[PDB]
Design a protein around this ligand. Structure first.
Ligand SMILES: Nc1ncnc2c1ncn2[C@@H]1O[C@H](COP(=O)(O)OP(=O)(O)OP(=O)(O)O)[C@@H](O)[C@H]1O
Ligand SMILES: [Mg+2]
Ligand SMILES: [Mg+2]
Length: 375
């Protein structure tokens, strides 16, 4: 049911805004939406109830109660050999594979009588509004009416937004939206690729599919150049990704395994999941990355708690009472570098995201204090 999904996602959000989090927003027709998403999660974090569904799913809210799943992107999936979810997979259970397109995800949602796009985290991001500019284009009037019909029937269409101005690694020639899959808002079930393919209105947009005889396509993908990789579709409908070493080496900081600052940078930037998959063959490198990952996730939880708890208890007091309490919390937690963080909050507290940026940047200034013991 919808409400137990909502309540389980809400549950995930009490832990830490480091981890799973939600954010409210209002569309141009004036109604509220809630997007559930995440910043950093570990393998144990992904085992909690419905955590794999907490990757951009959106509800329209009447205050605290949800009224409908307005949008439903793909479940979280991982690189092969990234963690136990993907480490003892029988490659013979692969049904087929899909070009992995290298842009930003956009998913449909119905707002009023309007069919619109949300990027993974927002209804108002630049990719979101750019994708809407495409949908409103007369040259996509026949795609848009189909997507509009799907959402009133409770299906979300998921595309990669790619463009010269949305460069990640791959250089596309032109700005487009590439339909990757369509999913049912209530069940999480997907319309089959073949069903989408034989709709000749949708087919022009649809990501390319390939057949495989046998798992040598894996190493060919790992060794290819000028591709991100492929998304594998299993006989049971689940997915995993496979990236080329070429993509991962450009998507990670250079020399990431030779330098602890660069490894922490890669982790902070959210690319250590692909790096460690790339180094799954090398148990020293894989477990080193994981140790740095654990260190930083553990620190971020601590730092965030201490900073936000301290700010919300003493916000508004005279500056040196506030300083006294900030002094206490930073010295008391063996984290004196946090004092400046807390005092930066004192004049102004915009988003809780800018707090994470300051914690994150500070961490990279003091990274040597934090290299896990033994490395
Ligand atoms: N054929 C495809 N099928 C599904 N997703 C695709 C496909 N091609 C590109 N993508 C994109 O791949 C994304 C997931 O893989 P990617 O490595 O880009 O994730 P990410 O942005 O690093 O997020 P995370 O690692 O947290 O899952 C999807 O959200 C989607 O935008
Ligand atoms: Mg991507
Ligand atoms: Mg990733």
């Amino acid at each position: 049911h919808m409400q137990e999904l909502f309540n389980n996602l809400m549950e995930l959000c009490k832990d830490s805004q480091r981890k799973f989090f939600y954010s409210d927003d209002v569309s141009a027709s004036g109604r509220t939406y809630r997007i559930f998403s995440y910043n950093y999660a570990s393998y144990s974090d992904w085992l909690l109830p419905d955590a794999l569904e907490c990757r951009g799913i959106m509800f329209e809210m009447d205050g605290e109660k949800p009224v409908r799943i307005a949008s439903r992107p793909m479940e979280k999936f991982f690189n092969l050999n990234e963690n136990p979810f993907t480490m003892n997979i029988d490659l013979n259970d692969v049904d087929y594979i899909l070009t992995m397109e290298d842009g930003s995800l956009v998913s449909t949602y119905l707002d009023g009588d309007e069919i619109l796009f949300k990027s993974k985290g927002s209804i108002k991001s630049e990719q979101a509004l750019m994708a809407n500019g495409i949908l409103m284009n007369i040259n996509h009037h026949r795609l848009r009416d189909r997507l509009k019909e799907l959402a009133e029937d409770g299906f979300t269409a998921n595309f990669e937004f790619v463009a010269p101005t949305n460069r990640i690694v791959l250089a596309y020639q032109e700005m487009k939206i590439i339909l990757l899959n369509v999913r049912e808002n209530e069940t999480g079930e997907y319309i089959s690729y073949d069903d989408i393919y034989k709709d000749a209105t949708l087919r022009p947009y649809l990501v390319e599919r390939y057949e495989i005889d046998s798992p040598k396509w894996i190493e060919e993908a790992k060794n290819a150049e000028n591709i991100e990789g492929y998304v594998a579709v299993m006989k049971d409908g689940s997915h995993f990704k496979i990236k080329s070493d070429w993509y991962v080496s450009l998507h990670s900081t250079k020399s990431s395994l030779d330098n602890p600052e660069k490894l922490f940078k890669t982790i902070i930037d959210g690319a250590s999941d692909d790096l460690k998959a790339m180094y799954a063959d090398d148990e020293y490198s894989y477990r080193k990355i994981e140790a740095f990952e654990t260190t930083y996730l553990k620190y971020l939880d601590r730092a965030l708690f201490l900073v936000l708890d301290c700010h919300n208890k003493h916000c508004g007091k005279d500056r040196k009472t506030y300083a006294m309490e900030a002094q206490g919390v930073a010295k008391g937690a063996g984290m004196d570098h946090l004092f400046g963080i807390i005092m930066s909050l004192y004049q102004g507290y915009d988003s809780q995201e800018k707090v994470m940026c300051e914690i994150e940047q500070n961490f990279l200034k003091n990274y040597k204090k934090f290299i896990p013991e033994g490395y």
